[PDB]
Design a protein around this nucleic acid. Sequence first.
RNA 1: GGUGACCACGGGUGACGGGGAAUCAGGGUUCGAUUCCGGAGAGGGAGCCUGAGAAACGGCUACCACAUCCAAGGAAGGCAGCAGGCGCGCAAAUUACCCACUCCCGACCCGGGGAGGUAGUGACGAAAAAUAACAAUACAGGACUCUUUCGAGGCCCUGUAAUUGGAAUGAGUCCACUUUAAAUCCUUUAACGAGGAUCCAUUGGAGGGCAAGUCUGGUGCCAGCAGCCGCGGUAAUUCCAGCUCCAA
Lengths: 131, 262, 141, 185, 58
Amino acid sequence: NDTVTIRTRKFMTNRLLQRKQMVIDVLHPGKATVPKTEIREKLAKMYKTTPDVIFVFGFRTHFGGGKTTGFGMIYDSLDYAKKNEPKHRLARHGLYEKKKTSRKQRKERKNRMKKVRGTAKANVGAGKKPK
Amino acid sequence: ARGPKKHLKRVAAPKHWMLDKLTGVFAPRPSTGPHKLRECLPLIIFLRNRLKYALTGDEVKKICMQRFIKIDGKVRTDITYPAGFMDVISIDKTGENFRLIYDTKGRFAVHRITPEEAKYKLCKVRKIFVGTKGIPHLVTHDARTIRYPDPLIKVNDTIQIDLETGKITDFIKFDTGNLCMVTGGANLGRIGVITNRERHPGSFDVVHVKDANGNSFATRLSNIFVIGKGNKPWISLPRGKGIRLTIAEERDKRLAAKQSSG
Amino acid sequence: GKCRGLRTARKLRSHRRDQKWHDKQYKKAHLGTALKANPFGGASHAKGIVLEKVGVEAKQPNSAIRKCVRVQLIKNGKKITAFVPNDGCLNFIEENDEVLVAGFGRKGHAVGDIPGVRFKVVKVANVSLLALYKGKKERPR
Amino acid sequence: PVARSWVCRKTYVTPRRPFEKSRLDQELKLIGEYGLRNKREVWRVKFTLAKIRKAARELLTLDEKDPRRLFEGNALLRRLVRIGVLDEGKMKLDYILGLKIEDFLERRLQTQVFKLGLAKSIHHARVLIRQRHIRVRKQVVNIPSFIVRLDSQKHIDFSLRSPYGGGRPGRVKRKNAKKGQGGAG
Amino acid sequence: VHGSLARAGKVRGQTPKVAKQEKKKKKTGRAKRRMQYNRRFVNVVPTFGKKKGPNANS
RNA sequence: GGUGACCACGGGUGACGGGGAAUCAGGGUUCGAUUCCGGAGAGGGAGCCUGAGAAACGGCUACCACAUCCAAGGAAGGCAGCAGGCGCGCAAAUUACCCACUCCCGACCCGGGGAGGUAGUGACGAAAAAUAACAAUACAGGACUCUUUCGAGGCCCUGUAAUUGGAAUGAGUCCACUUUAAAUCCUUUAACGAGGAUCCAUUGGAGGGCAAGUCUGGUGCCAGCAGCCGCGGUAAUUCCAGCUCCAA
Ligand SMILES: [Mg+2]
Ligand SMILES: [Mg+2]
Ligand SMILES: [Mg+2]
Ligand SMILES: [Mg+2]
Ligand SMILES: [Mg+2]
Ligand SMILES: [Mg+2]
Ligand SMILES: [Mg+2]
């Protein structure tokens, strides 16, 4: 924490997705890769925002420690951040849930429903028996 | 095949799209539109690879579906809409306008224009035919056709289409001594003046063009777009004024720029 | 002499492709009868079943009993004779073994003092003869 | 199908005839004098010089004032004087044919640290580079075959994390210290 | 068959089995190249012999 | 009538064509099943509906060859798609995860995609690159020097072997971060981690071609080696071994 610094570059703003995006590098001379949460709040202090709208990813560390570079994303509002931002990053921040079944099981149910025609009760009870 | 193709491999994409090899297997495959897919710039790569407003196809799809991209004064939500030559791309939320013009190396460059200049657009007439009730027509280099043109307008001349009306306000005849631009082939992107036109019946006419620096080249007639009345262009030219300069005088320009910046 | 006219290319190429049939390598590689006569059928290696164990007398200046196996190939059922190339590797060979046989060095020609033998055993029962000779692994009892 | 590239090339050529005393002795002399691991990484620099000389000879066969000849000649001379194997005043295609593989081997990082004196021998230089002790500018380099340019020549120095610049002594030093303090109060 | 296969492996059978002498490991790679460069490139011998080979059986 | 020694016609192809690949003075000679373009096919043929587009086969109809269920009255088939089996073979991978990327389809910002992406097997092949470095003692060597061989150290470079002898690191264990759809791997980074540093480099050779032994012990024209010359019939530079050397 004593020697960790954020530096921004390729900064630009767009109103198309209502955000400002940049590529940043953080300097840890002798420490591990800085945690994305730490980048989040430090960049929030940098741009006078809160560490709930900050979005960072793609942090690759140069050979031999020291510099690591990632792509930073800041939005004007959390509602816009929810509106246009990938669901996996929303789930990383905990704002999106993926509590669903496997792709294989989903395909099994989709193919089993094709054997039953029209009848709504037998079309919704298709996957009830072969669990 | 048993029908039309609706895929485009990444390596088989047009070279001027400046796509790489490792991102994926496929290319945008632009939808049918006013321009052929060989010389069109789809909006996905225009807003992802040229301006970096979007990082992915999904993001550029969101940008398009929020109805901010305006092409030729009309809102287009097609992610792979073929933009093409000198169609005005207007974004009002961020307030800039783009004119899609080839650079000196035959690639669509990011050319920014004022709104009062973006209000209009040059077109190259491709055919003139009279239709029913004796009504003349005019089909441009786009898919755009219009009725009741000036009878002085002939084939492969230039017309001034102002947006939001689709009408003609002025025109440039294809005449010796007029400023042109090459729209295909090796000399793509070169601004020059019509010096000669040799015509070969039953084949393609060849036009000889000299630029400002005196470099004279030639190209087929179908690759020429008249852009100026004599020597003043009717549009805003990109950087370099469409003057193709060789690698010998490109390298030392790079060295001078590096020396100035260092 | 040879013709040198500007439009003699037809005669030059015709004479070349006629005369190219007179050397043994081109004839062997392009006639196909050598490919038909080859027991391996143009393959580097082959598999077979050991029909018998035989001894072959060496040539005139030498005097030895080269140890070979009479082997029927699994494909096309052709019967060949394959040398067993080490000091005691015939003992690792028994009847009805599935042996792998390769060429014996010079492309379907006999090598050394062994008359009419063009193949050698590389593996027996899916274990290498080199491995058995060096004792690095054992026969599959 | 797959979006790979599979564009690769070999970097060395084996000699046409093996087992000749003159070539074997010359290659062994080079290996011993420059601290190379094997014959592959001297055939590699020989191949590089062969490619450079082939390009220079072909350019020489091109006519004078030919713009392709001029452009590629200045490019090749610029690269050669950046890597430092050619003097800045010898900007001619004829002098490229006069180069030798010793000039290229002298520009290796392994040789350069030994010449600068960061290591006591060429083999010590190689192991010192491999154990992440040598840095160029700010990047640490663990590749002995790192060709050093003239601008990067001055910026070769010990790494900060290594126990030769900054602190943090090695594991054996720390173990010896803790054993010593556990033996003596 | 004429019956001469009974002698297979005869000499390898009769050869007395002597074990390999346990020896120090040999340097490999760059160290090996350094060693064999030092042996035959940096040395001065005052003895005659007309440049005898590296495996002299003196 | 039309075509043919300017090679028609017929036959063969272990022939899909091309962009290209190997080799590399120049000229050429071989290879292109294989990711890009074009063509053809969906077990073999044949015929069709629909549709803008199919003679479609993850559409239909019939025959042939296989082949599934059957209550024997019938009914249902097409992996040269992704995986995965059997067979054939000298010969070729996991019945994994995901639509996160590139794009495609649809009424469509929202769904779907074994296209494709990711991981697993992977010495096909290509790039980089560990298996050690340094110092001090003995015994040598140097254009070494100090008195002119004699003796030594004001120096340098090897090898032999040691209580040396304390410095540097990984390969591995492994916390966290990072990566990522989620992981993995790489790069970071805690803590352990080297003195037969036993944390052990192999594959082929030592008559010539062709670098390397006229060493030693067995065998005795036998066993075997040997691409070719040739070696072996009791003193083997060539076999089987030990040691020592050679090449990568
Ligand atoms: Mg065929
Ligand atoms: Mg092909
Ligand atoms: Mg194809
Ligand atoms: Mg078909
Ligand atoms: Mg069909
Ligand atoms: Mg090892
Ligand atoms: Mg021996």
